[PDB]
Amino acid sequence: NWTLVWQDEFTNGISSDWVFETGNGNSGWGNNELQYYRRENATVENGNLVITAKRESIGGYNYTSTRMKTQGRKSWKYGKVEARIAMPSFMGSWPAFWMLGDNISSVGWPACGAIDIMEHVNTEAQTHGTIHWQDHNNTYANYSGSIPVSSVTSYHIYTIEWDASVIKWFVDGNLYHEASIANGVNGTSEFHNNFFILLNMAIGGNWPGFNIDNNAFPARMLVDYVRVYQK
Ligand SMILES: OC[C@H]1O[C@@H](O[C@@H]2[C@@H](O)[C@H](O[C@@H]3[C@@H](O)[C@H](O[C@@H]4[C@@H](O)[C@@H](O)O[C@H](CO)[C@H]4O)O[C@H](CO)[C@H]3O)O[C@H](CO)[C@H]2O)[C@H](O)[C@@H](O)[C@@H]1O
Ligand SMILES: [Ca+2]
Structure with missing residues (x-):
């Protein structure tokens, strides 16, 4: 069975x-x-948790938001990692629930690896699950799947199950993406290390683009909880 090893329920801050x-x-x-x-x-x-993206000017930038992480506090090798999230849907938006290798401080990205548990851009009617890494030839690799989500603005449960064989992605318990890491196949050795969690909402960038709906601010992403289970 799964054993709960860490959570934030945001009940008391x-x-x-x-x-x-x-x-x-x-x-x-x-x-x-x-x-x-x-x-x-x-x-x-x-x-x-409420992450509010705003049209607000500071340090030469015209939008503000939050990026938070457990780096240096909590990390895990294998487990079930999930969050219950309701996110805005507007042109320019790029919310994410993801993980990075603890060793990013030494080896950098993408050698450290990344597991995106949930990403969404713009007004898409789908969410994405992806791994990013440096393959056996030291080439930047990613492997992504997606699932239709007709209402990202409603609470959904975004999950991975991660063990020495495989990472599986789920929304509301529906499996939509899987990646073998067995034996470091396709150079996936660095998914056998500790990873920490991030949450953020970016505004614009190479993937969502630079067409921003300035009438969608302020915009809220709500996170009911983040949980980690292990065997
Ligand atoms: O040298 C080759 C190319 O280098 C380019 O610069 C690299 C820079 O892009 C890279 O930035 C990554 C950033 O892309 C990455 O985004 C995350 C996603 O990969 C995914 O995991 O989702 C999350 C959430 O949405 C998203 O933020 O995040 C990592 C960690 O922050 C970041 O490092 O960093 C590398 C290493 O420094 C740079 O080399 C350059 O722009 C190109 O011109 C060049 O061809
Ligand atoms: Ca809660």
Whole structure:
């Protein structure tokens, strides 16, 4: 059976296991994103994390939002990782629930690996699950699947199950994507390391594009909980 090993239910504020990013990072967090991250864009309302993206000017940027992470506090090798999320749907939006290898501080991205548990862009009627890594030839690799979601603005449950064989992705318990990491096949060795969790909402960038609905602000992403189970 699955054993619960960590959670944030956001019932009494935001856990001290989260650290917040500030600013636009290096070339828009590597994706030419337009937002400046802050602590102030994260609040709790009635047992939910609220990440609010705003049209707000600071440090030469015209949008603000939150990127938070458990890096340096909590990380896991294998498990079931899930969040119950309701996210906005508007041109320019790019919310994510994802994971990075603990060793990013030494080896960088994408050698560290990334598991995107949920991404959404713009007004798409689907959500994406992806791994990113450096394959056996040291070439940047990604492997993505998607599932139709007619209402991303409603709460859905976004899950991975991760073991030494496979990562499986689910929305509302519906399996839609799977990736073998057995024996480090296709150079997937770095998914046999500890990973930490991130939550964010980016505004613009290479994938969603730079057509921003300025009339969609402020915009809210609500997270009822994040949980990690292991065997
Ligand atoms: O040298 C070859 C090319 O390098 C390019 O610069 C790299 C930069 O893009 C890269 O930025 C990544 C960023 O893309 C990545 O985005 C995340 C996604 O991959 C996915 O996991 O989803 C999350 C959530 O939506 C998303 O943020 O995030 C990582 C971690 O923040 C970030 O590092 O970083 C590398 C390593 O530094 C840069 O080399 C450059 O722009 C190209 O011109 C060049 O061809
Ligand atoms: Ca909650």
